[PDB]
mmCIF file of C-alpha atoms (C1' of nucleotides) and ligand atoms in Angstrom:
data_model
loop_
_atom_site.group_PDB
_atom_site.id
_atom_site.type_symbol
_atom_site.label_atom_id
_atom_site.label_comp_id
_atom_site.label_asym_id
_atom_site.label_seq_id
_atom_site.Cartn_x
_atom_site.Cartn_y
_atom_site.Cartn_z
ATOM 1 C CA UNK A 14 -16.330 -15.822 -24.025
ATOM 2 C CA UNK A 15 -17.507 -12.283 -22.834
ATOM 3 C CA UNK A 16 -15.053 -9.269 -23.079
ATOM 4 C CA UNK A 17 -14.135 -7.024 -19.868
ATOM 5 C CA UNK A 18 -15.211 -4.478 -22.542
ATOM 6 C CA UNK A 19 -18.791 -5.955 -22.437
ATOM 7 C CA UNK A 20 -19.338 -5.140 -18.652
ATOM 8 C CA UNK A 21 -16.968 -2.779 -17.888
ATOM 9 C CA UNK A 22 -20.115 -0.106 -17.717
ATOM 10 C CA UNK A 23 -22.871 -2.741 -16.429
ATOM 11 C CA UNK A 24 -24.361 -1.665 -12.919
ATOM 12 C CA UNK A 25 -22.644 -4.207 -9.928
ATOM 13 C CA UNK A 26 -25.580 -6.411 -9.803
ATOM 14 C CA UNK A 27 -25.704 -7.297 -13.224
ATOM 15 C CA UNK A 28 -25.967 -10.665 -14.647
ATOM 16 C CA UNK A 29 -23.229 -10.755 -17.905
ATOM 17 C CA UNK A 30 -21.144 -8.760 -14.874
ATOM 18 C CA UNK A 31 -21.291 -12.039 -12.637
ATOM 19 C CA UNK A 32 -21.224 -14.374 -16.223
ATOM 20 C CA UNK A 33 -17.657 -12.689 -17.244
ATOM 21 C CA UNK A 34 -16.545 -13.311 -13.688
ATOM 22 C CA UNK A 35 -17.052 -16.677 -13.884
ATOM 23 C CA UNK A 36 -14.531 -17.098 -16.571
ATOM 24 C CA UNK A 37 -11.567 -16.366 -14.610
ATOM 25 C CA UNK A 38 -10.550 -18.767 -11.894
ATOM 26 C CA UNK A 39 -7.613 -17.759 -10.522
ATOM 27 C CA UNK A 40 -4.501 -15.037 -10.393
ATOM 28 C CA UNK A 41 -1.477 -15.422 -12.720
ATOM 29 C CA UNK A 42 1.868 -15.549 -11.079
ATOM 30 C CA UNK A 43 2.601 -12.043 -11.640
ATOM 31 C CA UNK A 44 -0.557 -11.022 -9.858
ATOM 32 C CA UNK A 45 0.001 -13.127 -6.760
ATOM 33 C CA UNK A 46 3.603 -12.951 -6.222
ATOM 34 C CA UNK A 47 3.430 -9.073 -6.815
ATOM 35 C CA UNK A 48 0.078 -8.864 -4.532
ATOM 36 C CA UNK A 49 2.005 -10.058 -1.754
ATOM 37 C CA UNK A 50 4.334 -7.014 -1.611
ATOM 38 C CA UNK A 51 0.942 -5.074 -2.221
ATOM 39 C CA UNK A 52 -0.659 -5.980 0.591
ATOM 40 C CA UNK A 53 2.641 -6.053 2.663
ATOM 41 C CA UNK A 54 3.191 -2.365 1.530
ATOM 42 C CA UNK A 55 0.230 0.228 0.458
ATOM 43 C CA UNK A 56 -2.676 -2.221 -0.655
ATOM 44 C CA UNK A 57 -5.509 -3.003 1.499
ATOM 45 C CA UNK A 58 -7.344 -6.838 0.911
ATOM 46 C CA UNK A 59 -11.279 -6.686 2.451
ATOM 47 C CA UNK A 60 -13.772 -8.761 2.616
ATOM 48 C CA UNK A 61 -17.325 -7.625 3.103
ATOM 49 C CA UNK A 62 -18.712 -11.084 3.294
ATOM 50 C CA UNK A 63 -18.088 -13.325 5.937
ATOM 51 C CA UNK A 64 -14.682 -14.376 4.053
ATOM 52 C CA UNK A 65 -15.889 -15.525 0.895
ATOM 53 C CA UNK A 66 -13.922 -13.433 -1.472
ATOM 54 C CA UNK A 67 -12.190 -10.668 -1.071
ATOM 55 C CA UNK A 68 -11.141 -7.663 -2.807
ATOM 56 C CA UNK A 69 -8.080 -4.987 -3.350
ATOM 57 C CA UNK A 70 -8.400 -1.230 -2.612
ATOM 58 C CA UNK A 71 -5.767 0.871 -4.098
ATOM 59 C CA UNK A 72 -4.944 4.342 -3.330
ATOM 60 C CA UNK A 73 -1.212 6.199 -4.167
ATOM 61 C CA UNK A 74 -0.368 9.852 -4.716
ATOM 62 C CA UNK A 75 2.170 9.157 -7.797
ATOM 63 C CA UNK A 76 -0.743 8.361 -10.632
ATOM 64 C CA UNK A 77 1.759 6.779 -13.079
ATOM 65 C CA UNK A 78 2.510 3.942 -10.780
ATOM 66 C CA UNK A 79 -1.147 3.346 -9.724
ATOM 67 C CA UNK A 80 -1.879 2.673 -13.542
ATOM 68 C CA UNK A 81 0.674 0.528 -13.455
ATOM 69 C CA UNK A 82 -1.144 -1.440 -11.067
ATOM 70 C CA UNK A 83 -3.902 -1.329 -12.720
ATOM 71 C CA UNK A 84 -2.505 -2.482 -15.817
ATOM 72 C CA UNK A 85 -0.957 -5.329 -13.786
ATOM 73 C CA UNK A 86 -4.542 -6.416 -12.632
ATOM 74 C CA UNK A 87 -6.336 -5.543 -15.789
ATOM 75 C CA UNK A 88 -8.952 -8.061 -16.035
ATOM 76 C CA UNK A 89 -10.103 -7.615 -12.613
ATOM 77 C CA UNK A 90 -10.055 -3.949 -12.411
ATOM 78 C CA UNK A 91 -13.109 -2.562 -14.718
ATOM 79 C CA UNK A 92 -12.531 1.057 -13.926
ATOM 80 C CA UNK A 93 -9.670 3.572 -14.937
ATOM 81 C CA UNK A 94 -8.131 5.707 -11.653
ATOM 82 C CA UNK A 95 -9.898 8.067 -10.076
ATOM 83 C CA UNK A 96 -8.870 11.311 -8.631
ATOM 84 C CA UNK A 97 -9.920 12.433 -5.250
ATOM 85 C CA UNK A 98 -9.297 15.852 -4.456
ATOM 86 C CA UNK A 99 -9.637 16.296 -0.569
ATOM 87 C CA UNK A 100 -9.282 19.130 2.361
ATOM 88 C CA UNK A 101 -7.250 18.792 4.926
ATOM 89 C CA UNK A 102 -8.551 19.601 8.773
ATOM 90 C CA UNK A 103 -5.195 22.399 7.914
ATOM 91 C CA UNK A 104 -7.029 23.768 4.567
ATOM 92 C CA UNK A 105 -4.888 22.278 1.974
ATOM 93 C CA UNK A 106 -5.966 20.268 -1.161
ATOM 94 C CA UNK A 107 -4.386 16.770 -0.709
ATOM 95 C CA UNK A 108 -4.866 14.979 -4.405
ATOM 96 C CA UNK A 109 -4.578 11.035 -4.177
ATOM 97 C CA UNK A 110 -5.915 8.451 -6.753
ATOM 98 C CA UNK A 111 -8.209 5.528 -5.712
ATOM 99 C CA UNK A 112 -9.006 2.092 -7.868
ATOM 100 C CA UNK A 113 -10.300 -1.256 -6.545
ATOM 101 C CA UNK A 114 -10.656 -4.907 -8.169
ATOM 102 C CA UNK A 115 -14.121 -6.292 -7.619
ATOM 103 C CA UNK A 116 -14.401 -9.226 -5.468
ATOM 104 C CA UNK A 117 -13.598 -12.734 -6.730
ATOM 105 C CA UNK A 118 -12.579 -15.912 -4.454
ATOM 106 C CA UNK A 119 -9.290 -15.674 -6.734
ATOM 107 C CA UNK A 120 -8.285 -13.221 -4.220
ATOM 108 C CA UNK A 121 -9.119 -15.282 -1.176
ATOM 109 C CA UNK A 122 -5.471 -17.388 -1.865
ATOM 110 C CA UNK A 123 -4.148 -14.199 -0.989
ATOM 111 C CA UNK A 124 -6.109 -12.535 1.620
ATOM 112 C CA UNK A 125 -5.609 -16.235 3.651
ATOM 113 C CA UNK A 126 -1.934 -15.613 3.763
ATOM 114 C CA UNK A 127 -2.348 -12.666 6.166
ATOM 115 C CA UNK A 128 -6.088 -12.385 6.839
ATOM 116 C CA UNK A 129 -6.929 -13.817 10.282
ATOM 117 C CA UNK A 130 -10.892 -12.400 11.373
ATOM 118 C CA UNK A 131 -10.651 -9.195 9.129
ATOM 119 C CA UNK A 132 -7.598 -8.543 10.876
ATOM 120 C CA UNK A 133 -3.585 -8.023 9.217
ATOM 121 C CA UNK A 134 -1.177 -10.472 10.190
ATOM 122 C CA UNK A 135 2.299 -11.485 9.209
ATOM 123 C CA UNK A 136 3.121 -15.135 9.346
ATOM 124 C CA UNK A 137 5.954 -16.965 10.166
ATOM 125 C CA UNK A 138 7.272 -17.982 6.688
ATOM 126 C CA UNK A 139 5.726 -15.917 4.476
ATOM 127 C CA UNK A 140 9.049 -14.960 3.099
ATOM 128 C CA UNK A 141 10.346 -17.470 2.749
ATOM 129 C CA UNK A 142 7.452 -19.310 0.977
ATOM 130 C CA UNK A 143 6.089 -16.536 -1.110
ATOM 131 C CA UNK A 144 8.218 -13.593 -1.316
ATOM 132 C CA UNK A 145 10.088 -13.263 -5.041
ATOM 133 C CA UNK A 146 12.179 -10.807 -5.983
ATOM 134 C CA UNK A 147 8.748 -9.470 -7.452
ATOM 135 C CA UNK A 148 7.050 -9.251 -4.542
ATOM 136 C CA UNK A 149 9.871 -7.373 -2.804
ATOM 137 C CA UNK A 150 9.883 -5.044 -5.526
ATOM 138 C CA UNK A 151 6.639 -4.146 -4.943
ATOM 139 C CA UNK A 152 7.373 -4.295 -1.180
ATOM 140 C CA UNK A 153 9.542 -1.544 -1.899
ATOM 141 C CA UNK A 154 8.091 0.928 -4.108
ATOM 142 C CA UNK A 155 5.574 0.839 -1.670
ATOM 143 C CA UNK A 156 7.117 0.953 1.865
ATOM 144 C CA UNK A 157 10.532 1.579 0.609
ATOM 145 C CA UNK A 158 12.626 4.624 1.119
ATOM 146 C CA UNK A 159 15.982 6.086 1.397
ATOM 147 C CA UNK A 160 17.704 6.145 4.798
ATOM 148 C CA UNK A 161 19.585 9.146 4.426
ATOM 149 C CA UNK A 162 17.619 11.755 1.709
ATOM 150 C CA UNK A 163 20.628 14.623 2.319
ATOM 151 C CA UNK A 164 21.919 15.854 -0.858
ATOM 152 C CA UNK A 165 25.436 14.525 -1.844
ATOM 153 C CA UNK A 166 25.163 11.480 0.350
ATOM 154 C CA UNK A 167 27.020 8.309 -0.973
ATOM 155 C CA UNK A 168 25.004 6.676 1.951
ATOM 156 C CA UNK A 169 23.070 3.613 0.102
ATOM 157 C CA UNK A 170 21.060 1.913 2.633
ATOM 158 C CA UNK A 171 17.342 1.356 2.222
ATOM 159 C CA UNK A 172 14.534 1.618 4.640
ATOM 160 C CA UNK A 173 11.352 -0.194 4.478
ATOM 161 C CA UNK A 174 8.504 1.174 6.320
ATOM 162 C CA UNK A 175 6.806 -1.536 8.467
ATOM 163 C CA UNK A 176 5.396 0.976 11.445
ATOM 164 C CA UNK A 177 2.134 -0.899 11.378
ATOM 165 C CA UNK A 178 3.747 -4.359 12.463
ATOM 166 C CA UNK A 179 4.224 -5.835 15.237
ATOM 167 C CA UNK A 180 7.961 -6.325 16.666
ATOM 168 C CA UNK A 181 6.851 -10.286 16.243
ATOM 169 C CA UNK A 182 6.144 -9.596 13.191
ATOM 170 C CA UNK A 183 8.943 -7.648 11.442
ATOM 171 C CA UNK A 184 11.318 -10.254 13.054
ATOM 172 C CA UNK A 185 9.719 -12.798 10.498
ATOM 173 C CA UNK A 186 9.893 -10.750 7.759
ATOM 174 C CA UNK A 187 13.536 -9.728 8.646
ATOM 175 C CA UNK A 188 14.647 -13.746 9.092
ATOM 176 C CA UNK A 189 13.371 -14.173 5.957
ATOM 177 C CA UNK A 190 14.990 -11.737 4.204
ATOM 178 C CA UNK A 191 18.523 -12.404 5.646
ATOM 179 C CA UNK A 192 18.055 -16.314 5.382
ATOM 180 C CA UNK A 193 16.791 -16.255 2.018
ATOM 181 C CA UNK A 194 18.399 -12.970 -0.174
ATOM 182 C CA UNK A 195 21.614 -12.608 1.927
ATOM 183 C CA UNK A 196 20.412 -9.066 3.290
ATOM 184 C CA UNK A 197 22.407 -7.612 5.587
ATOM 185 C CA UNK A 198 18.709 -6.049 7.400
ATOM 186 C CA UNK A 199 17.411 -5.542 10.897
ATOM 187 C CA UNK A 200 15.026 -3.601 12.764
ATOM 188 C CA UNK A 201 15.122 0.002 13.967
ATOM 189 C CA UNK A 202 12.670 2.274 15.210
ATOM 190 C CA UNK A 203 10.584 5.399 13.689
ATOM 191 C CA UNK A 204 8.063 7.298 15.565
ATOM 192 C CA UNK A 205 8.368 4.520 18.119
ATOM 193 C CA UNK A 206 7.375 2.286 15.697
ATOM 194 C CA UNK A 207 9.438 -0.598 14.117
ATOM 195 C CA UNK A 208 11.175 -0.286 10.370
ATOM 196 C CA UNK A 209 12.999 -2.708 8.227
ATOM 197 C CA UNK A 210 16.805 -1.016 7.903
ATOM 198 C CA UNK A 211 19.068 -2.499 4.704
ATOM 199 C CA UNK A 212 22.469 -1.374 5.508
ATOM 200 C CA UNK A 213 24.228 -0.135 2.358
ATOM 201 C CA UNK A 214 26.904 -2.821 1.978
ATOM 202 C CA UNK A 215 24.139 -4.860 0.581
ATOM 203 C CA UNK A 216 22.447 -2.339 -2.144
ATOM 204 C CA UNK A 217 23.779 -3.532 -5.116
ATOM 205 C CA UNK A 218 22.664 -7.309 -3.898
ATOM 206 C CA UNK A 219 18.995 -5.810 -2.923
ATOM 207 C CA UNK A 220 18.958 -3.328 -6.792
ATOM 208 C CA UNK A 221 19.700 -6.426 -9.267
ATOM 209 C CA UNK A 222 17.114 -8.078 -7.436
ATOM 210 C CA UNK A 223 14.065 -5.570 -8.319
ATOM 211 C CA UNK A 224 15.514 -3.918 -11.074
ATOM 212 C CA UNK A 225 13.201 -5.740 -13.564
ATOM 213 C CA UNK A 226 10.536 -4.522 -11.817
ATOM 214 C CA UNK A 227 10.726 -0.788 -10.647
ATOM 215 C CA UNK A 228 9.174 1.459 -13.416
ATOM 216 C CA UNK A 229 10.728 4.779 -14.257
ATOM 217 C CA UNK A 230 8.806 6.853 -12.416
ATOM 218 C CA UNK A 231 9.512 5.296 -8.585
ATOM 219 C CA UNK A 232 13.773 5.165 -9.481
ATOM 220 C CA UNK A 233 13.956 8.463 -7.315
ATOM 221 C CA UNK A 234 13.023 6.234 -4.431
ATOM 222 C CA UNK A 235 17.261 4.615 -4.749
ATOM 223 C CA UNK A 236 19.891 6.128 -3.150
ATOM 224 C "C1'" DA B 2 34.131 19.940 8.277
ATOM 225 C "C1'" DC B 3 30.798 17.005 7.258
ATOM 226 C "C1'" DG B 4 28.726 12.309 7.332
ATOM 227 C "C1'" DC B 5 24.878 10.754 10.106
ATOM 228 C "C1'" DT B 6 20.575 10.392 13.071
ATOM 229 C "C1'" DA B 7 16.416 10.960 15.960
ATOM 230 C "C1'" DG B 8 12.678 13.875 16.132
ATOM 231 C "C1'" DG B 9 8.972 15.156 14.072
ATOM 232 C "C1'" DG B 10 5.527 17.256 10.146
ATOM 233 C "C1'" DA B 11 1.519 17.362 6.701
ATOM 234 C "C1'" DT B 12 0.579 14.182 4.159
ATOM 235 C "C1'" DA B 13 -0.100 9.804 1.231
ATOM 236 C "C1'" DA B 14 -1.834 6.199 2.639
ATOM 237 C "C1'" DC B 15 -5.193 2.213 4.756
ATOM 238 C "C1'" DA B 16 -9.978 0.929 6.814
ATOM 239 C "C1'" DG B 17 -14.735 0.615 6.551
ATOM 240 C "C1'" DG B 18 -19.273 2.510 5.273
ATOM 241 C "C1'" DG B 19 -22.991 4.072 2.013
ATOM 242 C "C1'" DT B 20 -25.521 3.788 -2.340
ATOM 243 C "C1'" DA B 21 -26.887 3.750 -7.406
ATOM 244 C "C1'" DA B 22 -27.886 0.348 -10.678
ATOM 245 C "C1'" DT B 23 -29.824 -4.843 -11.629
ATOM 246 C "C1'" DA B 24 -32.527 -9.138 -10.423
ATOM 247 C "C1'" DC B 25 -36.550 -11.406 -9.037
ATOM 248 C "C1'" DG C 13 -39.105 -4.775 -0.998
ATOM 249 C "C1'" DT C 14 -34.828 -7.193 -0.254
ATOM 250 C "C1'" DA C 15 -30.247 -8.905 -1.854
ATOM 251 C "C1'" DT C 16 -26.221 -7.751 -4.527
ATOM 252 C "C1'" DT C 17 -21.754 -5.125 -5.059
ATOM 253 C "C1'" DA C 18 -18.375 -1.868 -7.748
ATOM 254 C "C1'" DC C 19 -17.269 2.802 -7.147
ATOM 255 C "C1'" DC C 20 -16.802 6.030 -4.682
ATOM 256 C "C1'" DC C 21 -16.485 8.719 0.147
ATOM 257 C "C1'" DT C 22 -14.952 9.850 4.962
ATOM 258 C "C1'" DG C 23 -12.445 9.037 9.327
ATOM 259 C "C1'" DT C 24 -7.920 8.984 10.638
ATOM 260 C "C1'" DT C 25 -2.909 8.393 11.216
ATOM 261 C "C1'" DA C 26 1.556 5.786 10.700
ATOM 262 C "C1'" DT C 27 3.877 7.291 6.720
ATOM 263 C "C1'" DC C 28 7.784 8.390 3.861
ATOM 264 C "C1'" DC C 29 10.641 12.481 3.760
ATOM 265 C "C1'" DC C 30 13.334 16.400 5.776
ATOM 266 C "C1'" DT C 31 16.705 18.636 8.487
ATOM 267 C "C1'" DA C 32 18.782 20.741 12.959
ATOM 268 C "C1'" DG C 33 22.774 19.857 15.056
ATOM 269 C "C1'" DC C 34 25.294 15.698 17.075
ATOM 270 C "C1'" DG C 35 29.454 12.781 16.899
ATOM 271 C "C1'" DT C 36 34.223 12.374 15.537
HETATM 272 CA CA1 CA D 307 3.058 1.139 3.628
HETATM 273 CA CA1 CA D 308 4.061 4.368 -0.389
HETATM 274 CA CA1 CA D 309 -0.857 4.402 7.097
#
DNA sequence: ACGCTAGGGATAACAGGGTAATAC
DNA sequence: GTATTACCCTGTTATCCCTAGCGT
């Protein structure tokens, strides 16, 4: 049994690199069901084959919860974080950190769920199938976000930003949510663009359910 | 008087592309 | 040389986040 510590230095190509890959088969439950908020939020699943295995491309500005990621993937992520320090087309220094998994068909269980040609879709029952109150976690330190940020506010609803989707689509993910956690949700519009809003009345149902999961450093993101 | 929104800004994210390091 | 592929890099905005001033 080869250690991640063994080829965590070994060029791409390399031979014990492939050999250590070979050991693991597939994601543990935490990976998947917490991938699927990932990829419904800030993560980005590619393949550069013709769908033979796929990958995950990370990139946040908070660095604490990116390791946390990282963490969470640990034996498919060979490289700490790295900082990219940019310039904007304004001047200004925009700091991010990037990470990746390497590719592995383990990730293709994934990627199938809203893969369709290379392109990002959201199915019809993906909530209700596969969404835990893991995933939505995830989901939500991610996309999520207060609907009122005034200071003082006793407003509690939540916001989850789904401007990418399709109308179509956010109505799936919004049946789900109702059907299956009792969220009182629907869709509103930003930039012209559709968002997931969580009226307040059900805030203390949507916190118990990813509480477990939210580390320290994302709790300013609840009202 | 003040809880709430819709309008909108400079990012903080997403998408793909290029290449240095192994194999044969 | 050609085939591989993890780790960067760059092109670009739809993002979270803020707040002027609206509604009651
Ligand atoms: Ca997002
Ligand atoms: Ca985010
Ligand atoms: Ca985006």
């Amino acid at each position: 049994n080869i250690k991640k510590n063994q080829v965590m230095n070994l060029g791409p190509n390399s031979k014990l690199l492939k050999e250590y890959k070979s050991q693991l088969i597939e994601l543990n439950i935490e990976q998947f069901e917490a991938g699927i908020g990932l990829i419904l939020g800030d993560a980005y699943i590619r393949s550069r084959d013709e769908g033979k295995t796929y990958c995950m491309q990370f990139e946040w500005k908070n660095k604490a919860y990116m390791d946390h990621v990282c963490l969470l993937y640990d034996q498919w992520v060979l490289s700490p974080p790295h900082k990219k320090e940019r310039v904007n087309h304004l001047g200004n220094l925009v700091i991010t950190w990037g990470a990746q998994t390497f590719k592995h068909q383990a990730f293709n269980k994934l990627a199938n769920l809203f893969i369709v040609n290379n392109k990002k879709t959201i199915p019809n029952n993906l909530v209700e199938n596969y969404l835990t109150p893991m995933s939505l976690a995830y989901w939500f330190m991610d996309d999520g976000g207060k609907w009122d940020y005034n200071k003082n506010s006793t407003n509690k609803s939540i916001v989850l930003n789904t401007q990418s989707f399709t109308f179509e689509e956010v109505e799936y993910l919004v049946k789900g949510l109702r059907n299956k956690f009792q969220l009182n949700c629907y869709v509103k519009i930003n930039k012209n663009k559709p968002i997931i809003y969580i009226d307040s009345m059900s805030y203390l149902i949507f916190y118990n359910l990813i509480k477990p999961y939210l580390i320290p450093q994302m709790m300013y993101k609840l009202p």
